[PDB]
Design a protein around this ligand. Structure first.
Ligand SMILES: O=C(O)C[C@@H]1CCC[C@H]1C(=O)c1ccccc1O
Ligand SMILES: O=C(O)C[C@@H]1CCC[C@H]1C(=O)c1ccccc1O
Ligand SMILES: Nc1ccn([C@@H]2O[C@H](CO)[C@@H](O)[C@H]2O)c(=O)n1
Lengths: 226, 227
């Protein structure tokens, strides 16, 4: 059908959701129909709803999820705290495949890092990304330690023949700092860096956001995702 | 030869140095000769000296450095910034081989986290552990996101057939919360949790530290490391 990208990250709180929303905006503005699948969502007591933040920030309406867990833990932990299983792997891949269609960028968002359990039994976002012939975008920080997490994540993909559509620095500080400029350049030798989102971007109104996302990415790479 | 252990971590700041000293201390108390080596050491310009810190807390005398750099950054960076070079793969491996004796436990403390470049080009503590046929002791946190990071690390050890010697939680809070509880239990399900050192164990004095260490590790596991 169309193009299916999983948006993973080297960890929690590296900015997967804001980057998701940002690539989603950029894609829309390039005239691409965007869907966003978020199979499992946790932290729903705190008020977390990444599907909502993407609809709010980038205007996506095709916004698909299966399970919502109140506790702010990895899925498995929050499902065990609820007394409730996790969606089956079948539900996720079938959901994502229904979602996919030609001319549609379907973004697939996981929870935490690449190898966290999403479905039972023991299924990760890496597995889901295999079952739907999806490539992976990797959201990374600029903090001390990010190259190792990146290489680990980049290796865990290659080990399953999951393509790496590249990195995004979820949060770019102002001003950078020695460690941030150094990592940004070192990340660049490791893989193609597609964008570095200015810090605090997740609090912008939908207009400001669409500007930042318009600029942050590269017009040609975006448009060439058809 | 004897037993070589690389001590690595899911990243930086997870307790590698103190775990090195704790295994080292407990091993000494088990009658085991111990050397420790820090092939790459950054942060010297702010007094970072992990060999010295291991000598302090555990009393190991046999300490071997090799590359030292001022800035508190990854070795590739601290070396570009001081105009200096990264040591060569075979110089690291040589520093370790010179320490390896039968009956000796040799600990090789890494520089933040398993895939960090220690030597040009892209030479990691993993490649070293292959060269010297070492097992890897993986230092972890109990914090959020530690599962993913630990699995990625083990997965990277297993892809080069570097045997995992188990995990150590470098700082273990008292009392632990729901998330610390869930991770320690979840962690124990993917690999052997050799220990969970108490928080701030780095501020214990010689006596307290050795008591902590001996308590933290299964004496039979420690003694089983070198025959
Ligand atoms: O989606 C996020 O990364 C932020 C979420 C919001 C609540 C806990 C975070 C989480 O999901 C998570 C945490 C630890 C390990 C795996 C995880 O998936
Ligand atoms: O070794 C540690 O983790 C603590 C040191 C203390 C100074 C920077 C840390 C460091 O070494 C480091 C950090 C990120 C990447 C590679 C690295 O080698
Ligand atoms: N470029 C970026 C990246 C991330 N963020 C912040 O990171 C949070 C995710 O834990 C988001 O909720 C958001 O607060 C941000 O503000 N700007």
């Amino acid at each position: 059908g169309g193009t299916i990208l999983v948006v993973t990250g080297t960890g929690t709180g590296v900015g997967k959701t804001v980057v998701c929303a940002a690539l989603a905006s950029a894609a829309r503005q390039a005239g691409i129909d965007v869907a966003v699948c978020k199979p499992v969502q946790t932290g729903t007591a705190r008020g977390d709803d990444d599907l909502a933040e993407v609809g709010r920030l980038a205007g996506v309406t095709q916004l698909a999820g299966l399970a919502r867990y109140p506790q702010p833990m990895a899925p498995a932990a929050a499902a065990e705290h609820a007394g409730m299983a996790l969606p089956a792997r079948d539900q996720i891949v079938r959901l994502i495949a229904d979602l996919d269609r030609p001319g549609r960028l379907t973004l697939v968002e996981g929870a935490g890092g690449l190898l966290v359990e999403l479905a039972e039994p023991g299924v990760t976002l890496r597995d889901v990304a295999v079952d739907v012939a999806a490539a992976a975008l990797v959201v990374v920080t600029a903090d001390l330690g990010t190259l190792n997490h990146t290489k680990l994540t980049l290796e865990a993909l290659a080990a399953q023949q999951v393509s790496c559509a590249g990195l995004v620095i979820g949060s770019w500080p102002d001003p950078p700092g020695l460690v941030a400029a150094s990592n940004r350049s070192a990340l660049a030798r490791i893989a193609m860096v597609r964008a570095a989102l200015p810090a605090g971007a997740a609090s912008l109104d939908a207009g400001d956001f669409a500007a930042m996302s318009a600029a942050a990415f590269d017009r040609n790479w975006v448009a060439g995702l058809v």
